[PDB]
Amino acid sequence: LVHVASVEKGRSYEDFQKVYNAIALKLREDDEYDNYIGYGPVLVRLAWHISGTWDKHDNTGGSYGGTYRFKKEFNDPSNAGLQNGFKFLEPIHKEFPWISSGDLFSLGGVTAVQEMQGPKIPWRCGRVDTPEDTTPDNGRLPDADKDAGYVRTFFQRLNMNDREVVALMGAHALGKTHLKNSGYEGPGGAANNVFTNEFYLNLLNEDWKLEKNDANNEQWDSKSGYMMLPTDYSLIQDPKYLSIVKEYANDQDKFFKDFSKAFEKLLEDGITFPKDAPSPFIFKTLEEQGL
């Protein structure tokens, strides 16, 4: 399967910076969502789940085709709760009907991270919508109730290595688990709509307790009111993972730099970019624009 990036006709940096600003302006406006967390965390989760279907072996799945717009992927049990990120973006797609679905879902994730004061993420245009029959089947996204060997093995399919996996998981400092979506409940920290390295700090400094929640699932709970998933706590159980966790709890700039590279790579897996294709765009935030 080859998927070649095709820039939307005649579009350039300024067009996509207009779509960025539209998403970012609505993130500021619709602030009440999920008890004032706002839409940013569900939008970086949506960009991860449309990319996380990729399989390196046959180049199926991935962010290129925008296939989450089809019922099979929209109704995947693993995507429960992401309909709220879709409905947030649907106004903006009506306003810029020329951007492809893959591009709009991935730029929403980029915009949310930078607007929640994360690192800049280089983003590239050119994903092309593909037919309903290209939609990957349910079951390619990871279970939460498993251990470190499962996480390592699952992420080899998206060929991410240990460092990349640990840098990507730092995004679980954002938002929260919702019992009616996943059977898990609670936030992982106090700053859950500002991008920081707090996931790593909480993992190493809190007093975790294995408890059973109302959906009868086990999760790691702390006195402070935070929770960690079994696959999250996995990172301090494995010796290779645990020493990268310590590296990111001791250096927030290295965390930001490595997250930026692994999230771009995540979003680009499966796509062939021609050598005459434009460079990756670095978008300015509303704040850097005085907007």
DSSP state of 69: G
Q: What's the half-sphere exposure (Cβ side, CA atoms, 13 Å) at 8?
A: 19
Contact letters (x/-) for ligand HEM, 22-51, by CB under 6 A?
-------------------xx-xx--x---
Instruction: Give me the DSSP letters along 7-68.
Output: PPTT--HHHHHHHHHHHHHHHHHSTTHHHHT-SHHHHHHHHHHHHTT-BTTTTBSSSTT-GG
Contact status: 38 vs ligand Cc1csc[n+]1C (CB under 6 A): no
| Residue environment code for 108-118, b if the CB has 16+ CB neighbours within 10 A, otherwise e | bbbbbbbbbeb
Contact letters (x/-) for ligand Cc1csc[n+]1C, 170-209, by CB under 6 A?
--x--xxx---------xx---------------------
Q: Which stretch binds ligand HEM (CB under 6 A): 69-77, 92-100, 178-186, 273-281?
A: 178-186
42 interacts with, out of ligand Cc1csc[n+]1C, ligand HEM, none, CB within 5 to 8 A per kind: ligand HEM
One-letter identity of residue 213: N
Contact status: 85 vs ligand Cc1csc[n+]1C (CB under 6 A): no
Q: How many residues bind ligand HEM (CB under 6 A)?
A: 24
Residue 131, φ and ψ in degrees, nearest 5? -70, 160
Residue numbers at the binding site for ligand HEM (CB under 6 A): 41-42, 44-45, 48, 81, 142, 144, 151, 168-169, 171-172, 174-178, 181-182, 184, 229, 231, 263
